[PDB]
Design a protein around this ligand. Structure first.
Ligand SMILES: Cc1cn([C@H]2C[C@H](O)[C@@H](COP(=O)(O)OP(=O)(O)OP(=O)(O)O)O2)c(=O)[nH]c1=O
Ligand SMILES: [Ca+2]
Ligand SMILES: [Ca+2]
Ligand SMILES: [Ca+2]
Ligand SMILES: [Ca+2]
Ligand SMILES: [Ca+2]
Length: 901
DNA sequence: CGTCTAAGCAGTCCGCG
DNA sequence: GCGGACTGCTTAG
């Protein structure tokens, strides 16, 4: 097998690399790597190295990396560009792995751990580490074992050994329900004291040194706590054994409001699962506790125990250890579903970066572009300082707020990357500028043709057409990977709908799920067998199809995110290829394309309908258009359709055979107008929307920009067994909206779109009547809480104090002097509840950490003083009023002359 | 901590004769 | 009451 790196570090003048050798063994080596950098030189001087603009360069080979770094400094002092890859480990990887890396995940040691720390005086601060570590569970991917390190003797209590037999039993048997599939994989080690636990842990770590280190909040809690505790007990040298190169560094992580410290472990790649989740899941959650995320992703019940966590070990050590093991397993289960570790390895090895650098699209793209240019003996420019400057973005059409009955949508495939490719936007393809007209003049095709030689964007930029730039070339590669995975995702989705249909008629037999690849559309033979399967089999198949769909989604969306990140990186001042001319070439071209195609679609549809000046495009945002299909449906007549699916077919065909050809023609003309390199504006049909045939549903409504709802029957070729709501921007989609309120508003919208005014009124009346029975958590608002200190004036709100911050200050007074009460964490999320006039808390709201029950000290008082009336008006009635006025509907029945009877 | 801009709504403060 | 200037938060793309 071909070799591949595991980790790489620069330590002084040495590269330290852990790698898999040609025999599949893990190895480590120290290499005194001599880097090269570059300077411009005279043309008379013969060289094979050229910068991206074709100017000749001389290569400078340095005795060591510190010499190369010192040279860069002196070049700045002189005021001359020092070219080349200044991150010497990326250059090392590029020299050492000069081929497309093929990696074998089975050789990569992926460690997942969690620690427990009993603490009587509040949250155990990692930087102090003053309390014993009393449990570690550490799962190793190579061994496939959970290694459990259990402290039996502590100043906070002596306990009995954990019992695997009790752990396996049902909760209903008094057990902990540790899943049976991991029971046999647990290696349990009790310890007499904390020193021996820790020494043994470090010896184990030495034996089985993580390459990828993950877990939940490991980077901000577990790692710094372990490091600092070992440091406190044994000294620094012992703690540095967590690094294979015995090198660590306290790293300061800064944001807008403050800073925190983490421990960098040289020769380990830390991918904290909470951060993988936030980057790759495309969710925004009310809470990021493992309990909350586990329940959301896996539908497993919250880990239930009595008393505070600080007393759990002494009261129920059995449960304490079991829950520590289950916590590690839940992370593995989330990853089995989401596959973020797989994704990270894929992207990291593709770009040839330290795996942990996948969190930074700038670093990822810098590496991809560098490797691409180095292949042609080209030399990358030096990174420079730029002041942050605002620049213009997308166009968004102002919609007329209303109901809209039949709607077809279309949008560009990979909009911004396709613009890059079409126009040929790249640092080295800049050909010059042209004299710009107002955008409106390009949109309406009255402006002079920008160029007869170069490829243009209406921001004034021109690009070479003779050869693809490195940015278009490399973006195309990733786009092509994205397209492949999206294919698998959509197949699994369509396959899921076939199973759903079949579940309407399950067979009465005993059988098994079919062994199939859900990434490919089911053959006729498979469809036939599915029609004969039991519900049990079909449900197992649906689960597997949906798991396949999730895996395709992870793979496709994050490749989408990467290529879109390059468009944005051009407007980031830390990017080597930062250029506002290129960033705005993309956004301004995007603005033109949307308004251009709006004009063309309106013109086309007025022609087919025989009208003039009618607005068929009702809305658009960035790269999308929403087209009213009412007139299309009415030309055939609703009476002529057999069912809903009949008109959906009709619109799908109309979109495919009439709309898309017309759109393509419009865009080909625009490509000629801008003289672009290649026509790549592909605006495919997204959604087909409308009410159920024969119903009084309104189909859809807009309230404003970025706020709408549609009843969708077909999405990107997926024909649903049951219609699905596409809701954007409305309160049902916001993590700040109470859980139960999200649910109720969605049901109100469903009724509006599917059933009509009377149905909505019946539901509203019921919700208003019963909502006071809803659990307090389900009706609490949610907000992030920043700058709590700024607004705190002696425990009370200062000027301009935000509502949620006021809530926190109320909470802080209510729990004052109590070290055991949960503290609100600056920058994290809180639940927020309004309080009625005259409450003992002395203010109008209270807030507490999200994902938690409010502390028992004050719970009963909060429940007693909760303002249900204010809550209802603010979170439910107000948004509903917004939806219904926009839709021209009433949520409460207005009096009529029939009331006389 | 980690690409980008556009733009919505909640709430504070205060004007609006 | 609403709305504008402003801060804060959160989405859509
Ligand atoms: C969703 C999203 C879009 N954008 C920008 C770049 C996108 O090309 C552009 C349009 O967004 P989308 O239409 O959401 O994305 P897309 O066109 O890249 O992909 P698809 O083929 O799935 O339609 O907006 C971001 O910068 N960040 C984002 O998170
Ligand atoms: Ca715990
Ligand atoms: Ca798109
Ligand atoms: Ca599409
Ligand atoms: Ca059947
Ligand atoms: Ca879109």
């Amino acid at each position: 097998m071909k070799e591949f790196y595991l980790t790489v570090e620069q330590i002084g003048d040495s590269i330290f690399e852990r790698y898999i050798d040609s025999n599949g063994r893990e190895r480590t080596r120290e290499v005194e790597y001599k880097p090269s950098l570059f300077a411009h030189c005279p043309e008379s001087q013969a060289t094979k190295y050229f910068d991206i603009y074709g100017k000749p360069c001389t290569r400078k080979l340095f005795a060591n990396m510190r010499d190369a770094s010192q040279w860069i400094k002196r070049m700045e002092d002189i005021g001359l560009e020092a070219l080349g890859m200044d991150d010497f480990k990326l250059a090392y990887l590029s020299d050492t792995y000069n081929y497309e890396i093929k990696y074998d995940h089975t050789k990569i040691r992926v460690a997942n751990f969690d620690i427990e720390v009993t603490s009587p005086d509040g949250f155990p601060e990692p930087s102090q580490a003053k309390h014993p570590i009393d449990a570690i569970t550490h799962y190793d991917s190579i061994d496939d074992r959970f290694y459990v390190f259990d402290l039996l003797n502590s100043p906070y209590g002596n306990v009995e050994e954990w019992s695997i037999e009790i752990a396996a039993k049902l909760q209903e048997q008094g057990g902990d329900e540790v899943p049976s599939e991991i029971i046999d994989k647990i290696i349990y080690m009790p310890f007499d004291n904390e020193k021996e636990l820790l020494m043994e842990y470090l010896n184990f770590w030495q034996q089985k040194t993580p390459v990828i280190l993950t877990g939940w909040n490991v980077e901000s809690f577990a790692i710094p706590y372990v490091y600092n505790r070992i440091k406190n007990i044994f000294g620094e040298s012992t703690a540095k054994r967590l690094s294979p190169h015995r090198k660590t560094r306290v790293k300061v992580i800064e944001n807008m409001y403050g800073s925190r410290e983490i421990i960098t472990l040289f020769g380990i790649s830390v991918l904290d699962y909470i951060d993988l989740y936030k980057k790759f899941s495309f969710t925004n959650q009310p809470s990021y506790s493992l309990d909350y995320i586990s329940e959301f992703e896996l539908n497993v019940g919250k880990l239930k125990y009595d008393g505070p966590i600080s007393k759990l070990r002494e009261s129920n050590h059995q449960r304490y250890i079991s829950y520590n093991i289950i916590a590690v397993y839940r992370v593995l289960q989330i990853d089995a579903k989401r596959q973020f570790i797989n994704l990270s390895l894929d992207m990291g090895y593709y770009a040839k970066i330290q795996i942990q650098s996948v969190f930074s699209p700038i670093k990822t793209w810098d590496a991809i572009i560098f490797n691409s240019l180095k292949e042609q003996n080209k030399v990358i420019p030096q990174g420079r300082s730029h002041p942050v400057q605002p620049y213009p973005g997308a166009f968004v059409k102002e919609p007329i707020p209303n109901r809209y009955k039949y709607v077809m949508s279309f949008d560009l495939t990979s909009a911004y990357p396709s613009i890059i490719r079409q126009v040929n936007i790249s640092p080295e393809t800049i050909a010059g500028t042209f004299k710009v007209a107002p955008l409106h003049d390009y949109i309406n095709a009255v402006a002079e043709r920008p160029s007869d030689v170069y490829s243009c964007s209406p921001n004034g930029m021109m690009y070479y057409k003779d050869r693809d730039g490195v940015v278009p070339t490399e973006i195309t590669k990733v786009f092509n990977q994205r397209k492949e995975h999206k294919g698998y995702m959509l197949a699994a989705q369509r396959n899921g709908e076939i199973i759903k249909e079949a579940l309407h008629n399950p067979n009465l037999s005993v059988d098994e799920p079919l062994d199939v690849d859900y990434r490919f559309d089911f053959s006729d033979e498979i469809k036939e067998k599915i029609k004969k399967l039991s519900a049990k089999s079909l449900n197992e198949m649906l689960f597997r199809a949906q798991r396949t769909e999730v895996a395709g989604m992870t793979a496709q969306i994050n490749r989408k995110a990467l290529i879109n990140g390059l468009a944005g990186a051009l407007g980031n001042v830390w990017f080597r290829y930062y250029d506002l001319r290129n960033a705005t070439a993309i956004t301004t071209f995007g603005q033109m394309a949307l308004q251009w195609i709006e004009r063309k679609v309106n013109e086309y549809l007025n022609e087919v309908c025989g009208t003039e000046g009618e607005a068929f495009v009702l809305y658009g945002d960035t790269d999308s258009i929403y087209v009213s299909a009412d007139k299309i449906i009415d030309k055939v007549g609703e009476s002529k359709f057999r069912d809903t699916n009949h008109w959906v077919d009709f619109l799908d065909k109309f979109a495919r055979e009439r709309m898309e050809p017309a759109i393509d023609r419009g865009f080909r003309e625009m490509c000629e107008y801008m003289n672009n390199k290649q026509h790549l504006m592909f605006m495919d049909r997204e959604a087909i929307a409308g009410p159920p045939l024969g119903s009084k549903g309104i189909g859809g409504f807009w309230t404003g920009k970025k706020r709408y709802a549609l009843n969708v029957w077909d999405m990107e070729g997926t024909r649903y067994a049951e219609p699905k709501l596409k809701i954007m921007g409305l309160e049902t989609q916001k993590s700040s909206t109470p859980k139960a309120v999200q649910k109720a508003l969605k049901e109100c919208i469903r009724r509006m779109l599917q059933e009509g005014e009377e149905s909505l009124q019946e539901y509203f009346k019921e919700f208003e009547k019963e909502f006071r029975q809803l659990n307090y958590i389900s009706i609490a608002s949610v907000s992030s809480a920043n700058n709590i200190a700024k607004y705190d004036v002696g425990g009370f709100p200062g000027p301009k104090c935000p509502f949620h911050i006021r809530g926190i200050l109320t909470y802080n007074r209510a729990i004052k002097g109590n070290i055991d009460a949960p503290q609100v964490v600056e920058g994290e999320k809180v639940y927020v509840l309004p309080l009625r006039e005259g409450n003992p808390f002395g203010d109008k709201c209270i807030a507490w950490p999200s994902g938690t029950e409010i502390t028992d000290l004050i719970k009963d008082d909060v429940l007693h003083w909760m303002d249900y009336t204010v809550l209802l008006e603010k979170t439910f009635i107000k948004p509903l009023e917004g939806f219904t006025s926009a839709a021209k509907l009433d949520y409460e029945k207005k009096a009529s002359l029939f009331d006389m009877f």
